[PDB]
């Protein structure tokens, strides 16, 4: 069974599109705030909410411990991807994150008006979408727009 389960997880991972992969990479980088290549518990607690999940602290610790299979005390990129496949709340958003990272041309984590204009080669916009008035659209505001 566990074998079959592992086989299914591999199918899912292999079935991710390259655009979904780029989205997951942006998610990872968003959480890995110091760009160290490794996500710590502190980063995970600060960052999960930004990628649309915001679990309870105890739930985040459970995720951290399950994902950290080499007991590094950190989540690396490969561990992160594997983990998203075990958390519906996150993996269900892979397509939305693919779309967000497409608009977020510079991988800044926020869509700016200039990026909006770049995309429209494809600004009442900002008023209804930018809910916190920082002049940028973050992932959560993007999801809310999509609804
Ligand atoms: Ca880090
Ligand atoms: Ca690890
Ligand atoms: Ca940006
Ligand atoms: Ca904003």
């Amino acid at each position: 069974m566990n074998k079959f389960k592992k086989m299914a997880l591999r199918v899912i991972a292999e079935s991710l599109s390259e655009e979904e992969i780029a989205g997951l990479k942006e998610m990872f980088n968003m959480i890995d705030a110091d760009k160290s290549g490794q996500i710590t518990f502190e980063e995970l607690k600060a960052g999960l909410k930004r990628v649309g999940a915001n679990l309870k602290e105890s739930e985040i610790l459970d995720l951290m411990q399950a994902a950290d299979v080499d007991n590094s005390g950190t989540i690396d990129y490969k561990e992160f991807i594997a983990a998203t496949l075990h958390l519906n709340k996150i993996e269900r958003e892979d397509h939305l994150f693919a779309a967000f990272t497409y608009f977020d041309k510079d991988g800044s984590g926020y869509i700016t008006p200039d990026e909006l204009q770049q995309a429209c080669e494809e600004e009442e916009l900002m008023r209804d979408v930018d809910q916190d008035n920082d002049g940028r659209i973050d992932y959560n505001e993007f999801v809310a727009m999509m609804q």
Side-chain angles (χ1 to χ4, degrees), residues 1-122 124-147:
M1 202 189 70
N2 298 344
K3 167 90 167 293
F4 189 19
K5 198 188 295 182
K6 288 186 186 184
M7 291 186 54
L9 294 175
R10 188 61 163 282
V11 175
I12 285 170
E14 264 72 321
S15 298
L16 295 176
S17 72
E18 256 68 294
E19 292 94 8
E20 285 180 290
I21 296 300
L24 284 162
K25 185 149 229 333
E26 162 122 337
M27 248 196 262
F28 181 89
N29 287 337
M30 218 169 109
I31 297 173
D32 180 26
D34 65 2
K35 311 313 172 297
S36 72
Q38 305 277 327
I39 289 171
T40 61
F41 187 45
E42 291 105 306
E43 280 172 329
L44 195 64
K45 294 202 302 171
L48 278 169
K49 65 181 68 162
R50 297 184 60 202
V51 305
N54 196 14
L55 311 179
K56 283 171 192 56
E57 205 174 337
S58 55
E59 303 181 333
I60 293 173
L61 176 56
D62 288 342
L63 163 58
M64 173 86 204
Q65 295 307 278
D68 181 25
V69 299
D70 69 348
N71 294 311
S72 72
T74 57
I75 302 306
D76 66 23
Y77 176 67
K78 279 193 163 182
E79 280 167 342
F80 179 73
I81 286 160
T84 58
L85 305 186
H86 280 94
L87 246 152
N88 184 260
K89 312 303 157 278
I90 294 160
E91 63 111 88
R92 84 167 301 169
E93 305 214 322
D94 291 356
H95 300 293
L96 261 60
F97 232 103
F100 183 87
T101 110
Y102 169 92
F103 294 114
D104 181 18
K105 298 286 189 273
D106 63 1
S108 59
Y110 299 86
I111 307 175
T112 57
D114 209 352
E115 287 174 321
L116 269 346
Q117 206 282 155
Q118 244 172 108
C120 281
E121 275 160 46
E122 150 149 359
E124 45 184 295
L125 253 193
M126 291 297 304
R127 161 53 158 139
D128 194 323
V129 182
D130 176 13
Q131 279 165 109
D132 63 9
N133 302 305
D134 67 344
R136 311 179 291 197
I137 293 172
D138 66 21
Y139 178 68
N140 286 329
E141 291 161 333
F142 179 78
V143 171
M145 191 201 118
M146 287 326 99
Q147 251 123 260

